[PDB]
Amino acid sequence: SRRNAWGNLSYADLITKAIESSAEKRLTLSQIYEWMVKSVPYFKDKGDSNSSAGWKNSIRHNLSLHSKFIRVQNEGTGKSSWWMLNP
DNA sequence: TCTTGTTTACATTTTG
DNA sequence: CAAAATGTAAACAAGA
Numbered sequence A: 001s002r003r004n005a006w007g008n009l010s011y012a013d014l015i016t017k018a019i020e021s022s023a024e025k026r027l028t029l030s031q032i033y034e035w036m037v038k039s040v041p042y043f044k045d046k047g048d049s050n051s052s053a054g055w056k057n058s059i060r061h062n063l064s065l066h067s068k069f070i071r072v073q074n075e076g077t078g079k080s081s082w083w084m085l086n087p
Numbered sequence B: 001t002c003t004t005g006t007t008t009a010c011a012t013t014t015t016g
Numbered sequence C: 001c002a003a004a005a006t007g008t009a010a011a012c013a014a015g016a
Helices: A010-017 A029-039 A054-065
Strands: A070-073 A084-085
Touching: A010 A029, A010 A054, A010 A070, A010 A084, A029 A054
Parallel strands: none
Antiparallel strands: A070 A084
8 A cells, every 4th residue: 555656755755766866966857857757657657747737846845845955056058956965 | 938946734644 | 642744735936
């Protein structure tokens, strides 16, 4: 009996795995979504923001909330913010 | 307008 | 038990 359609891991924990599966160990908001879709089965079929407002909002909430994650300036024009694990 | 972030509420579960 | 967590849902503000 899972805790979520995708199992017992939490959004914040899923995010961690994402960021922590990156070379520079840092992702922008958009990539984190894509990671979920490509790494988590329950989401493989939810990329269409047409059916993906719930888990995206949640993911944005988790990011912006828990000091576990920190926002780091990403150099570039029209680029989003880096998101890294807080040491 | 669609993205990004932040915040605030609420209902439940888990923790410590 | 009470506090920290969690998952949703939403209101608002500044960016691309």
